[PDB]
Design a protein around this motif. Structure first.
Motif, PDB file in Angstrom:
ATOM      1  N   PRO A 158       0.794  -1.240   0.000  1.00 37.09           N
ATOM      2  CA  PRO A 158       0.000   0.000   0.000  1.00 37.09           C
ATOM      3  C   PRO A 158       0.824   1.287   0.000  1.00 37.09           C
ATOM      4  CG  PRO A 158       0.095  -0.865   2.206  1.00 37.09           C
ATOM      5  CD  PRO A 158       0.861  -1.846   1.343  1.00 37.09           C
ATOM      6  N   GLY A 159       0.266   2.378  -0.519  1.00 43.90           N
ATOM      7  CA  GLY A 159      -0.986   2.387  -1.243  1.00 43.90           C
ATOM      8  C   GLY A 159      -0.709   2.212  -2.736  1.00 43.90           C
ATOM      9  N   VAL A 160      -1.747   2.394  -3.539  1.00 41.74           N
ATOM     10  CA  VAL A 160      -1.646   2.433  -4.996  1.00 41.74           C
ATOM     11  C   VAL A 160      -1.043   1.147  -5.583  1.00 41.74           C
ATOM     12  CG1 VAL A 160      -1.077   3.843  -6.938  1.00 41.74           C
ATOM     13  CG2 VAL A 160      -1.172   4.943  -4.717  1.00 41.74           C
TER      14      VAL A 160
END
Ligand SMILES: COc1cccc2c1C(=O)c1c(O)c3c(c(O)c1C2=O)C[C@@](O)(C(=O)CO)C[C@@H]3O[C@H]1C[C@H](N)[C@H](O)[C@H](C)O1
Ligand SMILES: [Cl-]
Ligand SMILES: [Mn+2]
Ligand SMILES: [Mn+2]
Ligand SMILES: [Mn+2]
Length: 10
Positions: free
Chosen positions: A8-10
């Motif tokens: 995380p993230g994305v």
DNA sequence: AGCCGT
DNA sequence: ACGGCT
């Protein structure tokens, strides 16, 4: 997370 | 199943 | 206020 286990993230 | 920061 | 894949 990851993927897998995004980021995380994305 | 697996957490974070625009 | 609220999203990202294998
Ligand atoms: C009911 O939604 C939530 C409830 C509790 C915590 C959360 C959220 C939540 O939706 C959330 C996110 O949507 C995002 C993130 C996040 O931590 C949470 C929660 O913690 C982190 C993320 O900002 C980044 O990684 C930036 O690099 C991207 C994503 O933000 C989305 C929306 C933003 N406006 C921006 O468009 C970003 C690019 O994607
Ligand atoms: Cl998006
Ligand atoms: Mn789930
Ligand atoms: Mn936070
Ligand atoms: Mn969500």
């Amino acid at each position: 997370t990851x993927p897998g286990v995004t980021x995380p993230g994305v």
